[PDB]
Symmetry: C2
Subunit: 67 residues, 2 copies
């Protein structure tokens, strides 16, 4: 439903990943993610869903990679 810029950064920090690496694993551009992390735009509802999914279920990154 909702996720703040600080929370988006924190998800990435669980994985000890740089922005570019995390973005790539989410099939999202680095710059789009930067905009979200920096509070310049809001992610769409499916992106929020995706970030929240990865947060709680880290194995989702691997699933994505194998798509």
């Amino acid at each position: 439903l909702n996720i703040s810029p600080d929370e988006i950064v924190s998800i990435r920090e669980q994985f000890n990943m740089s922005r570019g690496v995390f973005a790539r694993l989410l099939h999202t551009s680095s710059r789009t993610l930067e905009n979200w992390e920096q509070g310049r735009s809001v992610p769409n509802g499916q992106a929020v869903t995706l970030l929240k999914l990865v947060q709680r279920h880290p194995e989702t990154l691997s699933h994505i990679a194998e798509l």
Copy 2:
């Protein structure tokens, strides 16, 4: 770049024996938007496509999503 065809979107939903409205709500979109994706009038945004292919290959994902 990931892609999912309109027919594939319909098949995923039917596989979940789910109405268009419920599936849409779980994906955080409207039934009207999902209908556009299913009929090929629109293509989902990139994160939407990713979610769809996940739910397609990993069914348990829908359960995870429901509980976020």
